[PDB]
Design a protein around this ligand. Sequence first.
Ligand SMILES: O=c1[nH]cnc2c1oc1ccccc12
Lengths: 112, 381
Amino acid sequence: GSNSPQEEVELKKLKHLEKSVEKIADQLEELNKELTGIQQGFLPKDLQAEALCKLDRRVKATIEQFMKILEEIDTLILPENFKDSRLKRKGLVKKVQAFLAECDTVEQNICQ
Amino acid sequence: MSKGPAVGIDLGTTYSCVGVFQHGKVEIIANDQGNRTTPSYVAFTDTERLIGDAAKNQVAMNPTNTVFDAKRLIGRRFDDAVVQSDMKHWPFMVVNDAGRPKVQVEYKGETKSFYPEEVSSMVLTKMKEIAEAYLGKTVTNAVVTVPAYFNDSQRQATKDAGTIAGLNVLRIINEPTAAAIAYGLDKKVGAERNVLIFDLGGGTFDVSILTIEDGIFEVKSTAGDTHLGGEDFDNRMVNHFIAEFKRKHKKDISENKRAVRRLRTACERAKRTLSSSTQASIEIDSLYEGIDFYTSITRARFEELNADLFRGTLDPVEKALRDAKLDKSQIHDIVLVGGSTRIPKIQKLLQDFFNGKELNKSINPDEAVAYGAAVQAAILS
Ligand SMILES: O=c1[nH]cnc2c1oc1ccccc12
């Protein structure tokens, strides 16, 4: 093979961003659990809307954190020979974008 | 904590900076987030009030309740042409309270209004605290800087912000006077000196001419552009890239706010790199419709896109020389202030104008005003 020590530095940067994405994804999961909670809970139809709308700041904070992750990924310059780093970066970007699409789904179904 | 020394505070439009003279040298003070400069931002949420980095970081989530640009309002009447024109571009509300402007936001569920000096006092409190955290001592005395064109009301309103913040304002000094002090232009032996300050940063452009005779400062003229800064250079870069993505992929990314933001942020970083390098590379994965945007910009391309804006910086210099009744040959010293003065072309243009005269640029342009104020604070304590 042709694996370089220099690439280990880039893969370590990517592994930290992967862990950061996992932390935000757990916030999105708790929001999802909470959102269902209000919907399938004991609050009357009226009180539910207000409670679901209180999650707006949190959904927006989740979206913003993902955007900051994207901006940090965008600062990487990975030469053509760093095949594994280019794959990890692409997979991570696609992962974040799919989570962002889930956030938009949440955002569109609250505060209406 | 024990009593601490006097500090220099540069109360900027977009960013503020605090410095302390100790051990025969100025130390710019980094904040808790490790930044030497702090956003002049105040955010009001449902649970708390945020200042600096924390307020700027949540601006996308709470735009109407995140106040910035209070310097643009400080000391002004509501019906001021500047207040009315700036109002259109702010996400937050500006209301009239008996002829005075007030920022209107929602704080903890309720509607609250603050005078510009109250907002600036929150920013000064944070700068006071940034200094206390580093020094391990209580900070009360400070020198606060204001632009040379500030009137009686604008200067009093700034001194009031200091008072509200629990500060003892040793002196209020002009930002170009502060930059001259930083370079020790008042300590040079000889006849009176004519100094031109070229301040391009923090969203404003200011050109000032000063005369110094026996350590005495006189403002001879002030000129500039109220809304010219680095953001204008970024827009040109973004436009160039949008045009490029259209040429290459026949797709328009401009109506996608997240693609435009990703591109803009990459442009701001590429601009900074082009001040020390002749080429900047950008790699953005799945920018728009899955398309990876791997590009590059040369320093010559960036200069061309911004040629008019860069050239236009000399008009204010000419206007300032006219008003000060001075020829460009009568200027002893030229001082660079603001982050945008790091741009090599701006430097080349300005030096060529003064027929190859060397520029005072060694102090960080962003920290030069706070540096001088810190020196002044040490002199007055
Ligand atoms: O504001 C800036 N404009 C252009 N170049 C730079 C600016 O801040 C910088 C910080 C470090 C390096 C270049 C720059």
